[model samples]
Target: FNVAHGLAWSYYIGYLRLILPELQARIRTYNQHYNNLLRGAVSQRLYILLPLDCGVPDNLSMADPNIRFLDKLPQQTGDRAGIKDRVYSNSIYELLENGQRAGTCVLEYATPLQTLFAMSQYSQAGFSREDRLEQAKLFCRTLEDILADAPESQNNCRLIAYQFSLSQEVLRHLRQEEK
Candidate 1:
């Protein structure tokens, strides 16, 4: 989970560095805006993965057309320290309290896989059983692709592969109508 999360973070940050160099710099200076956008992107991506019996709408793209995903990366300075503090704290109550005060949500700390799982669950009720399983597989595959190009330090490729393999097993079971 850590590996995938790191890879996703690095990939997004690196992509922003290439396409929106100026916004990347500005993100370093504007912590609130940066965090807001980052959280928004992450949340939206996760929301798309939640599996529904009826499935998600085709028109809903996890990546918004107007906002470039990479440009939302939060800089690792300034408010980053505070953000991390709230996210990593041992006390859930304290974390929630601080998050509410900051107008933030704990979803900001969710790993990429966790976020994907959430999205899958959310959308599951809308999809058919088979489609729900396929949605999970697709979400896992998307995470794998996002992490594949990340830096070596992130080390998420193998982890995502393992997850996808597991998801495939579950999908097969769904296809077979096996518990």
Candidate 2:
């Protein structure tokens, strides 16, 4: 009983965090930018940020439970837009499309740890050592910005320090050699 309850409670915290006004405001800005390029679409574009390791195996089951968030949006009755999915190594960004109306909605599913991990991998994949270190460093700094603006009151300390220390570790190792 205790195990089941804990699992359910975590899910609640995970989903609830996405709706915070600060994050929603950021989402709105991206939505506006993407929607402008879509033909005959609603002013509001939908986006949801999920936990780092929530859905896996790509069975395509996430939308059923999470679609409730879409209901909270103010959508037009005549809108023909349909949901689209995009899966990446660490994050997912999706699109909404209906014939000529197609635009990406940035749905961040990767937590900062996953995001940093993905960035580090990609930066090392093909860049020259000099360029690689700089790219890795830039990723670290951008993640610091994300944590600096992180909205949760209780989690701020843990979240900020986690990124801070990890950035140092990675950057230090990265700068050690031109490898």
Candidate 3:
């Protein structure tokens, strides 16, 4: 479960880069726009996931219902596992195609790792250091693979390069290595 959660976060972040090359930049611009024009309003959350579960696997199953917050979206579902599975699958595919359309090379294919990380983080059971390290390794491997096939455009390439560089820094810090 711990491993799964780590993977989930990684994949989500990667997908964000793919679907929106300038997402972080856009977020900043939005914040500025809101602050200046909308009187300091900000987004409700940086990200959101549906079908939340408490710390118990027994409490979760394929048939368990999805739980949504705020107003319902078109993608909302009643089956928790099914919702998660579908969202993860569809989002990854969409982001992959979208990234190409936006003139960016596909960076990391992180759906499997992200799903594992999600399970680890959200499950009743907790993850261990070893589990996290394993996920990190997988994430690093994915980043390496993406870099091997990376493109050269500054706009298209910068986001993935930034993500890879940051992930590597995290790995170094986690392993307690000196520069």
Candidate 4:
């Protein structure tokens, strides 16, 4: 029951607009990789694949957006090291402890996939099982397309690998269901 949901969640996390900046940064670094002699030397040239001919969705929305706060404490302890001021906190708990609120902070929303999954929980009148399965396949394919364009790095290569592996599993299961 949760297998498809896992695929949906992965797709939701990866394709969110808030996370796109990070993805864009990955693209930026990949392009800049050649500039670093030591790093570029060992790595062979690679092309960014385009798996989705139709392209990815430009924008999307969700319900009950998740909010994060990044704020500096009003008062700081006098430590000569000066490390605390240099760092910002994203934890809502820390934000609350510091007497800060989420209204002024960055907001990350849920994906449509999340909404779909939620819809499936109550009844098929809203989102049917077949539709959910189809949507999962769509998300899996879309994720593969985006990952194709994202250049793999030492830090994120494992995620790329696992996502592809999971995508294969989801798609394979989908194909088997049809047969």
Candidate 5:
């Protein structure tokens, strides 16, 4: 995991982060489609929406904070071809595994509109049915805002496509409920 994570991060740093206009445009195009979806449903899920916004209290920086380990990672495993004086058994492997899991979990999402439906049901809001429906819309809109700014990445685009399709389903549900 150590050497693999190191190489993967290096690939991202070297290839993905470069200032390429076409890639930048691709990011924009995807984000635009996502933003449009957000706009239409921007008025639902209010109770859980704001609460969720508050719940996600973390930095949105593109770079991992524990990046210093990348350089040492290649050397630690000491298993590369022609590499000499390598440590046979690195103990920090468990630590590397820990970080890898954290990185993977961040890029994924739950089932289509699953959380939205759940939040709507358990919102604990003191309002009429219509009012609660609006609250749910707010949550969806907030979700749209977050997805709107998602930066372009080799891995993230695939995830976004899946999320977008699910968003379509979510939009359908909202459309049904709106009537």
Candidate 6:
């Protein structure tokens, strides 16, 4: 993340991508599924990635049956630091707080798709015509970058500022433009 490094920005691909289903194949490449969903075990710690339109709502729910989430996390003796759920807002943070002293918890969260006929929406929303054209071109370049792999990778953290359009400018305009 250029932002965070000095900084351009960054985000957990998992935070966004995990909620999607179709990405399972790509998700597996990053790590093997041990009964646990996270790494940093035996004194290591937590966190989570997947990719692209690979997201499909139906497929994201895959997880070990033993995986715990939300309110259930505090029950583990590992819940040292006395992990408690406040306004975790029913998200990964809730599970993340769990088995605290022990570290690492995998909680499966339910998740979305497309074919031409099975499109997310037949119509695209957000962005003016100029912005739409801008994005189309941007995507072309992004695709090139992916194919090149020289300009992007885990070290690159390019997604936040670009791909997902999570940049502050995008956020600012997105909210205002919605009105």
- Top candidate on TM-score is 4
Per-residue CA lDDT of model 4 for 147-176, tens digit only, reads 566544222321211112222322232234
Per residue, candidate 3 scores C-alpha lDDT tens digits across 34-63 of 345423222211221121221213211122
Query: Candidate 5's C-alpha lDDT?
Result: 0.29
Reference-based TM-score of each model: 0.27, 0.27, 0.27, 0.27, 0.22, 0.23
How many clashing pairs per prediction, in order?
25, 0, 15, 0, 13, 12
Report the Cα lDDT for candidate 4.
0.33
lDDT of 2 by residue, 18-93 (tens): 3332333444544464345434222222222322222222222243222111212322122123634321111123
Off by over 4 Å in 6: 1-44, 58-71, 74-86, 89-104, 107-119, 126-179
Worst 10 residues of 6 by lDDT: 1-10
Stretches of model 4 off by over 4 angstroms after superposition: 1-112, 121-126, 152-179
Candidate 3 whole-model C-alpha lDDT, 0 to 1: 0.33
TM-score, predicted candidate 2 vs. hidden true structure: 0.27
- Sum up the clashes in candidate 1: 25
RMSD of each: 16.3, 19.5, 14.7, 17.8, 20.2, 16.8
**Model 2 accuracy (lDDT, Cα):** 0.31
lDDT of 6 by residue, 1-179 (tens): 12112111112232222222223322343234333545432111122221223332322223222123322221211122456531221122121223342222222221211121133243564334344334333443443354255322332221212222212222232234235
Model 6, C-alpha of 66: deviation from truth (Å): 10
Better of 1 and 4 by TM-score: 4
Cα shift from native, residue 137, model 4 (Å): 1.7
TM-score of 1: 0.27
Worst 10 residues of 4 by lDDT: 88-97
Q: Kindly report the root-mean-square deviation of model 5 from the true structure over all alpha carbons.
A: 20.2
The residue ranges of model 1 lying beyond 4 angstroms of the native Cα positions read 1-84, 89-125, 153-157, 160-179
What TM-score, to 2 decimals, does candidate 4 have? Answer: 0.27
